[PDB]
Amino acid sequence: IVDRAKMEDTLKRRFFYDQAFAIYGGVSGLYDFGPVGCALKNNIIQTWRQHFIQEEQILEIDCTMLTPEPVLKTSGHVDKFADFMVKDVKNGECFRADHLLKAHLQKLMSDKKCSVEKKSEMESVLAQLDNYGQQELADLFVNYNVKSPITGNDLSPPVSFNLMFKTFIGPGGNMPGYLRPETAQGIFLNFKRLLEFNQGKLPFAAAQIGNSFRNEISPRSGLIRVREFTMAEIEHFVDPSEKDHPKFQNVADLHLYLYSAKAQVSGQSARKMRLGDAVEQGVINNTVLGYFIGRIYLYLTKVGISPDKLRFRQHMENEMAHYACDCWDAESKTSYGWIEIVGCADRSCYDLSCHARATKVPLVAEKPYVEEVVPNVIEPSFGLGRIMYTVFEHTFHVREGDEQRTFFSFPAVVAPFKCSVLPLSQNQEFMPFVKELSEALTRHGVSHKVDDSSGSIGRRYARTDEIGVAFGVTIDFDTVNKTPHTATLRDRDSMRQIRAEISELPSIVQDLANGNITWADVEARYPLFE
């Protein structure tokens, strides 16, 4: 439970993100990220690079966004990459049928005049929404007589709407193209040279961190529904018969809420299992898929996602994408309900074959006299956009005080900047201290900034908390005059402080941010300062 209104106001005001082309009315689904928003957005991409590319020695490539029609036709995007759209016969307003039907049903379940028996029937309908194909949706749109959410008019029947943007490469119109809806395709088209890097053996993973475009129908979910976002996709090619990851044990003891496809149809709830035990019962097919599922859990957590609001929902029989056979999604409980922030699929061979059969160019690998095989790819799809937004809601808190101050409990690895060095006076009396501390912090690799804003030391930290600065050191007169020279180390979340010698503080803030010492540990070693 989070007050979205209050939050968005803080985010936009401190400029984390805001409506793109605002002075023109803005375009729904498009936002610009201000300074802090970038510092945070950057820290997350940096953490991801470490957690995956670096930790797994993933081959990184950077393909183009512009794509010639022929390429996406083969992958099957020109045909299946779409959403069902409806529009009131009156004017020409469009809506994503998929969601409008869900918005309506939720409206009925809320009305007090609704029977318990119907409430159920509907809950069953919503828990199977991503399965209802073309026809099935048309009927539900009749049975429930869904009508325009605005000036309730009559909606035309649900029709598919290709989400890919369209353009023309070069003068003339002989080469029509689209803006890549995903990045994965680029890695497949380069499978040859890529496989060559690993001596030709499997498994090997290729990755990409770039922009994808999705001409969303009716974006109304803040940063959740954008037509332009940055995503980090991993394409882990493995031998279909050797689907066993040599590191699965490093993430086997992790306990996370799994929501099988069965539990979704068998009407029961998600169970908090153990990955190791998960693979046993057969919930999670193999251990490769299992390994990444665990790593994904670790990443999201380390970046600011709350475990008590993070689950992995499996897909339904016919919910499968036009390129997958099995899949699991990392969903976060937000103010918009459960939403897919990271998508981990298991699109066995499909892709490579399509491009090979179309271009008349072989894309395979061999294994020991020797047999050629079609690699089975597990693609963890990260939406850095939704992932960041989740961190926003999960860490946005309101300080217990009439002034209604807010703050984000951002981990030290993602906060705009870890420490905030703020002195009382800027005269040449404090400089020798501010200068030292700063440079000292830098040597320890702790991002910081010397606060200049006006107001009381308490109002200073008030602005610091808003953008979620992890810590803060107060340098007052007793620090400059008294001796030993000690400063005040203030914790963001607790607001509780400490008084240690200003020379040792750097190493202290370092361990605190790096998770080598607990704030409790600090209060035990040094004298508390009210």
Place this chain on the structure above:
Amino acid sequence: IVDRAKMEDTLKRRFFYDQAFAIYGGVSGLYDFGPVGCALKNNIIQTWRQHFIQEEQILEIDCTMLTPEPVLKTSGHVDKFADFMVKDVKNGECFRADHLLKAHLQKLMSDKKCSVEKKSEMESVLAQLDNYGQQELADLFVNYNVKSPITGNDLSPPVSFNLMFKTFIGPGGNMPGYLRPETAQGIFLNFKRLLEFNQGKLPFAAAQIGNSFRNEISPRSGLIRVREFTMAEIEHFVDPSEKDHPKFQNVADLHLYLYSAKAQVSGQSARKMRLGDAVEQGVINNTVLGYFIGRIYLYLTKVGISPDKLRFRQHMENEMAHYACDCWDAESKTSYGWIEIVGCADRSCYDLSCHARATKVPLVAEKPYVEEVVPNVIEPSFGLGRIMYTVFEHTFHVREGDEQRTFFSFPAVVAPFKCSVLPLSQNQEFMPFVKELSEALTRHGVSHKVDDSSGSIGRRYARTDEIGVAFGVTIDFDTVNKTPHTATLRDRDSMRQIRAEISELPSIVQDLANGNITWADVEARYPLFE
């Protein structure tokens, strides 16, 4: 002088970059960057972030690429952002008139039957190509009777061709849009909130590092002419009356080739002046423009550009962009002649006014009772693409040996990875040494990789040189058996080696890469090893 053919072959083979959608024939102007290409491309963006954003405390924002028609119409891109295109009346092949006329004239100047008097007349025509407007070009295309470079047919008259990509945002066609040709526009549309960050005072600079799209007519310049590239633009807003940068002295003693607009019309050559002296004579208007010009020189140099092939050419009277009044470009002497890699303009007020007058929203600032002024922006435009490619040619060398081996003399700050630790055997005899050195290097922050490839130690380094790895440490038996345990430190460019104790090598390689010690210094302290 560089053998482009040989180079491109090495780049593509080691996969620095290559044709996007290769297995489909590829699309001209589109390329994909392989692993090494990314490591290098990343290092350059990282260096730029330090050299500018970090060194100047620039406010970083990240706007959208999709832009609604109304926004670009105001900036004046829907009208002037184009190139003159011609096409042979036979089939429908298009060409950029601007360049075809230049290709033809160069053909004539080469023919031995050309008179000295005409050769001149033409040299004068080419040195004024970016000034010839619509009509002027049509005539030259008649006087010289230019015809299709292929199967020489007849070219239609030169007509403008808008370079901006076109699409449609959202279902329907009520909101037509383009893919931003530049990033600057985004910073202007956010001038309000941005100015607020600096307390409302000037000067203050905003920056952006993102992708821009330019539907180039006929791309045939490798990575020089792309329809999709990453650029880092800086928008330094300053008071029109206070055009004086407080750091100009830090870059005043720099000596760099300046090519005034006069020297371009007065038919003389570029002079290697001193920035300080440059501002005096009035060559470079103010010192703000001068400061960035110096910093730009430093950056390019630090990344791998050769001074003897780097100049700053000023624009011509009517060469000015549709948004500028004065400008200077950093051009690199490549195999394609002189090309603009970094563009530093001085588009005084223009922009902010246009958006304000169109949206009926004021975008100004005040100064001390108080007067509101229209900020004069100096926009340094970096094309990380062309900049990287220049580094390629300027540092690509061929080893003097029949085997025809190649290598790139990449600075330590941009090389894929600084050091290459390569042992002879991988047995548990060397591991205790490889492990230590590696971890030791990491502690010193030196990017490295343990070489595994097969072949002689000399053939191992042969592959290392190709991707331009700065150094390399050889760990042989005398390192494991003999004591003290010393390894071999090999320099890339010189191939000359050294023999120092394997424990001290880390700190040595660190200073070498960080420019704290010269390779000559090393050969003076430690025993040479043949």
